Amino acid sequence: QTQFTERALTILTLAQKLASDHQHPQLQPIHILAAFIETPEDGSVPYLQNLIEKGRYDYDLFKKVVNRNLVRIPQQQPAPAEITPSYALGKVLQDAAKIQKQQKDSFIAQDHILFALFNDSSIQQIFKEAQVDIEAIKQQALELRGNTRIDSRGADTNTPLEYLSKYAIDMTEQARQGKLDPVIGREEEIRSTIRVLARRIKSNPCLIGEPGIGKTAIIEGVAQRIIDDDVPTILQGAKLFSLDLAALTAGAKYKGDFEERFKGVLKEIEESKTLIVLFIDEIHMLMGNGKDDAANILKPALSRGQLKVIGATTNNEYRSIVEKDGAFERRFQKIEVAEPSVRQTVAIL
């Protein structure tokens, strides 16, 4: 007694509606495929379009082939009120159920219907006529969700986050689960970091000091201050991600791979409806040492306003960046982070 997901039910609903508009006797796999290439109600990217476009195929050609093959189906003269499923479609629904149990999922989703679709010879010649490798789209569907199982009725989102999951860590959700420890003696420097983020000019703080001094403790303090809603109006409901440069580097063995991954992370941020503050440790390994390509990706994104960045570097390394990039100095506010022994002495003097 398995149940469908909300998006899977929408596909079967659109397929039932498309067969009714074309007045076709029975529901066929071509209808479900036509429901996949259908533009969603909210203008979001369809699930199948993302797989095909990221596979670097011509999606417009694919739509044109599916439509001309569906119009090729003759229209019955008197439209009945009973659109039964065909024998070919019955196997698809039965095949999607075993695909769900094969992957140990709790619900039948778009993926399972799409996988069971790939087995029908009707849609197999559709992909061949559209010159789209059907086995490459299958690989795209496998890599998409990763290894996260489908537990809820709405776990099969069309375009899940691919770059923010591989090369970033959500510090906010990690703070909700009590995986962080509040370090003492740094609330004054946390207050300054949040004050800069609420600003509209130079809204990107940059922590200055030697690594391992408590910089990571300040970021974890800002995250837990966003969770309990102790932040100004602008930061209410904002997620705090941490860019993993080691993950960006591992596997990038081709020229431009690092920039492509970094551009993909920023793209998922700028399209997010909620404001996202990205923390970049050792930011000099991005904006300095003659790395102009990475700088030309972050600087325009900061101007659009959707992204706020918390940088972290040493004093001499920050001065090295500013000495050859005035535009960087006008977007980042300097915040000095000293060792507790030095922080206590300065306050006494």
Residue numbers in the entry: 4 to 352
Task: Give the original sentences from the paper that presented this experimental model.
To provide a molecular understanding of the functional role of the Hsp104 N domain, we solved the 2.8 Å resolution crystal structure of an N-terminal fragment of yeast Hsp104 (residues 1–360; Hsp104ND1) comprising the N domain and an extended D1-large domain featuring the first α helix of the D1-small domain, termed the C1 helix (residues 343–351)39. To solve the phase problem, we crystallized an engineered Hsp104ND1 construct featuring three methionine substitutions at Leu36, Phe118, and Leu248 (Hsp104MMM), and determined the crystal structure of this variant by seleno-methionine (SeMet) MAD phasing. The unbiased experimental map enables tracing of residues 4 to 352. No unaccounted electron density was observed that could be attributed to bound nucleotide, irrespective of the 5 mM nucleotide (ADP or ADPNP) that was added during crystallization, suggesting that Hsp104ND1 was crystallized in the nucleotide-free state and indicating that a complete AAA+ domain featuring both the D1-large and -small domains are needed for nucleotide binding. The N domain can be divided into two repeats related by a pseudo two-fold symmetry. However, unlike bacterial ClpA/B proteins, the N domain of Hsp104 features a four amino acid insertion that extends the length of an intervening loop region (residues 40–49) conferring asymmetry to the yeast N domain structure. Surprisingly, we find that the N domain of Hsp104ND1 interacts with the C1 helix of the neighboring D1-small domain. Binding interactions are hydrophobic in nature consistent with the notion that molecular chaperones bind misfolded and aggregation-prone protein conformers that expose hydrophobic residues on their surface. N domain segments involved in peptide binding include helix A1 (Leu12, Leu15, and Gln19), helix A5 (Gly93, Leu96, Gln97, and Ala100), and additional hydrophobic residues (Phe7 and Pro88). We show by structure-guided mutagenesis that the pseudo two-fold symmetrical N domain features a bipartite peptide-binding interface, involving the first helix of each N domain repeat (helix A1 and A5).
